[PDB]
Design a protein around this ligand. Structure first.
Ligand SMILES: Nc1nc2c(ncn2[C@@H]2O[C@H](COP(=O)(O)OP(=O)(O)O)[C@@H](O)[C@H]2O)c(=O)[nH]1
Ligand SMILES: [Mn+2]
Length: 394
């Protein structure tokens, strides 16, 4: 990096995007909702690119990709519900395989249940995660963990004292892509139990990613609970000071530094908006996660112990890495993928004579609870992270 370029990136990473007192968060929220609405109420259909791979084209189905779910035996019914919707809106026409992972062994009744609801030719694989690749490591002082998570539960932080949740966040941050079953894939579509898909997708999504050089796909973009991640930003800035060469000059820096809608988030973390891609859905190019900057960052966070001493989610961790170490024009917003996971929905608008969406979601309604409208970070991403080529992609 040219030293001027780097200094300029470092200056932006060390100041708020908006100066104190030059904005009112209520007016910011209103303008952000209007910008969001202008996008969600725009009639769209499919990406406006000429290279889409249709069902039954020679490249259809040929990406090295899998639908991935980390689930418990007890999630069988809820994951089935998700799978049926993903098949109906997408995968029945493309036939990508499913990979299931669990920290316990899957039962035969789990496997049989999954198979009973899929076509006979659909490939399914089931894997167990080795205990050393899941459990709290020896580096952690369990008694400190207990005391930190006591304090945290008084603040009412969800799952603070659920050890499995900590393990999950860490596994989805830094380990899942090392599981042996995934060594043969370049792409994953992450699927969680109890989600909904609303709109038909008539192109191969992995091939779209590959052909248009996208490393990451998302649908929803949110603020996080700052008390789960008290020191994640400050640690991540220490890592970046030690490895400036990992910075991408076209990183999503404004999105990380936007203090205007939720200034108390930014103050609590001492410099991070807390905006993140909401990873319960994600399309991901595993070559990025396997790359030196991502793996080194993961090691650094492992050493800090914040997966256990705090409640660091996979979503902010993945999102910091993507924003700092990759070109933001490589991160695609799948406007067309109508999708819900409680309590939020991406519900796009179709042309009047289209039957592409099934009508089970209300277009543009992010959430039924207007108090949570200020948890939407999508306006920040639209305003600061999308250039002309992204803005005109739908
Ligand atoms: N195998 C396994 N899966 C887990 C465990 N805890 C969470 N998950 C899965 O990890 C994903 C995220 O967890 P979830 O409970 O949905 O958390 P939330 O979406 O963050 O509320 C989902 O696919 C869960 O099924 C666990 O202890 N074992
Ligand atoms: Mn979930």
């Amino acid at each position: 990096h040219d030293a001027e370029v780097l200094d300029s990136i470092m200056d932006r990473l060390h100041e708020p995007l908006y100066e104190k007192d030059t904005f009112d968060p209520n007016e910011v929220l209103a303008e952000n909702k209007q910008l969001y609405e202008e996008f969600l109420l725009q009639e769209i259909s499919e990406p406006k690119v000429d290279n889409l791979v249709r069902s039954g084209d020679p490249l259809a189905g040929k990406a090295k990709g899998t639908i991935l779910s980390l689930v418990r035996n007890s999630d069988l019914e809820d994951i089935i519900s998700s799978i049926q919707q993903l098949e109906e809106e997408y995968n029945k026409n493309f036939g990508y395989p499913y990979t299931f992972l669990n920290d316990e062994e899957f039962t035969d009744e789990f496997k049989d249940g999954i198979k009973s609801i899929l076509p006979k030719d659909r490939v399914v694989e089931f894997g167990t995660i080795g205990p050393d690749n899941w459990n709290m490591p020896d580096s952690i002082d369990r008694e400190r963990y207990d005391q930190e998570m006591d304090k945290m539960s008084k603040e009412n932080i969800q799952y603070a004292e659920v050890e499995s949740y900590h393990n999950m966040c860490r596994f989805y941050s830094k380990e899942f892509y090392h599981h042996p079953l995934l060594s043969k894939y370049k792409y994953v579509w992450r699927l969680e139990p109890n989600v909904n898909f609303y709109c038909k997708i008539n192109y191969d999504v992995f091939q779209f990613m590959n052909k248009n050089d996208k490393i990451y796909g998302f649908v929803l973009n949110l603020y996080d609970s700052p008390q789960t991640i008290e020191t994640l930003w400050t640690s991540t800035m220490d890592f970046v000071e030690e490895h400036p060469n990992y910075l991408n000059v076209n990183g999503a820096f404004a999105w990380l530094k936007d203090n205007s809608q939720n200034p108390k988030n930014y103050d609590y973390t001492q410099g991070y908006s807390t905006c993140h891609f909401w990873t319960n859905f994600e399309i991901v190019d595993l070559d990025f996660l396997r790359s030196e900057p991502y793996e080194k960052y993961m090691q650094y966070l492992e050493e800090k112990g914040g997966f256990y001493y705090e409640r660091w989610g996979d979503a902010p961790v993945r999102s910091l890495a993507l924003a700092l170490f990759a070109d933001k024009s490589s991160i695609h917003w799948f406007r067309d993928i109508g999708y819900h996971h409680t309590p939020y929905t991406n519900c796009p608008t179709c042309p009047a004579d289209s039957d592409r969406c099934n009508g089970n979601c209300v277009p543009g309604k992010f959430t039924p609870w207007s108090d949570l409208d200020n948890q939407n970070c999508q306006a920040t991403w639209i305003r600061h992270s999308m250039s002309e080529e992204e803005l005109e992609m739908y």
